[PDB]
Amino acid sequence: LVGGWQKKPVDGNQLFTELAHFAVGNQVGDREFFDTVLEVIDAETQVVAGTNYRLTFKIAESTCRVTETYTKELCLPKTQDVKDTCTAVIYDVPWLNQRSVSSFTCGV
Amino acid sequence: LVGGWQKKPVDGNQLFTELAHFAVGNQVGDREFFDTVLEVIDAETQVVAGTNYRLTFKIAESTCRVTETYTKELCLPKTQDVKDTCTAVIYDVPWLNQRSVSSFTCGVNAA
């Protein structure tokens, strides 16, 4: 789900300052020096919920070379021989079209 | 905020197949060919809510070179003189120790 944007007070919110520093400390580009925060002046927040998935599954070697772009429909199993069993943890946030794998381990 | 882990049936659930394929198709290590998914056998889920932060702030040029490490406490402003105003959106998910900047732009507003 995604919630509405809400204006918040800047006030004594340390986290705002911490998150601003986090953003501006990560802008390199074509600057000789980093810029840094003098002050925050507006602040809005928005709940954004995703789902974290822990999936266990059987794998096989596929026919696709890793140079290629993977697809379910192109990268079919060479043989119906199980190779391993694996567990993966995937965080999915459709609202921001983000999806990430945090862990992936086999020999389960 | 984080919901509880819940066991879910594999059943037909096409999302789980899509998510397994997604994970396996992003593993290129120690392998000439991608592995692919034969079948899913367990599934658990956890709602995790993060917070998206839209922050507007005034910046100054700092004393730290880009070669160096940024820290608020080391990279103090040269002068208490504004040089630009910027807006950033940051998605924070402390529960997964993920944090990301989705946009960073330096236009200023008396909107």
From TrEMBL, chain B:
Residues 1-107 form the Cystatin domain. GO terms for cellular component: cytoplasm; extracellular space; vesicle. Transmembrane segments: none annotated. The keyword Secreted applies. It comes from the Eukaryota. Disulfide bonds join 64-75, 86-106. Belongs to the cystatin family. This is Cystatin domain-containing protein. It comes from Amblyomma maculatum. The lineage of its organism: Eukaryota, Metazoa, Ecdysozoa, Arthropoda, Chelicerata.
